């Protein structure tokens, strides 16, 4: 649910196993996705993706370069 306007949207998590870093009621940063198109094995009609959680990039958490602050 976006903080600015209260709308509810569906986004992609980049990889399975990044779901473990994300918990419910967490604050995340969302960017756009899918202007170019949708790849094979991607669900059409979803136009958002999750980029950061607690202001930390998901790739840095996955690679073990940073730790999520509570």
């Amino acid at each position: 649910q976006l903080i600015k306007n209260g709308k509810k949207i569906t986004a992609f998590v980049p990889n399975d196993g990044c779901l473990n870093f994300i918990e419910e009621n967490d604050e995340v940063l969302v960017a756009g996705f899918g202007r170019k198109g949708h790849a094979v094995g991607d669900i059409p009609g979803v136009r958002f993706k999750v980029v950061k959680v607690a202001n930390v990039s998901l790739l840095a958490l996955y690679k073990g370069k940073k730790e999520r602050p509570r």
Partner: peptide, 29 residues
């Protein structure tokens, strides 16, 4: 065998987008 596979990979790339795949399937239908 590898040369034959690489030719099909180019055709797979030649429709790898979601809208492209649905494009032919209506046309083949």
């Amino acid at each position: 065998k590898e040369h034959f596979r690489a030719k099909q990979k180019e055709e797979e790339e030649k429709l790898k987008r979601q809208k492209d795949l649905r494009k032919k399937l209506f046309r083949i239908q």
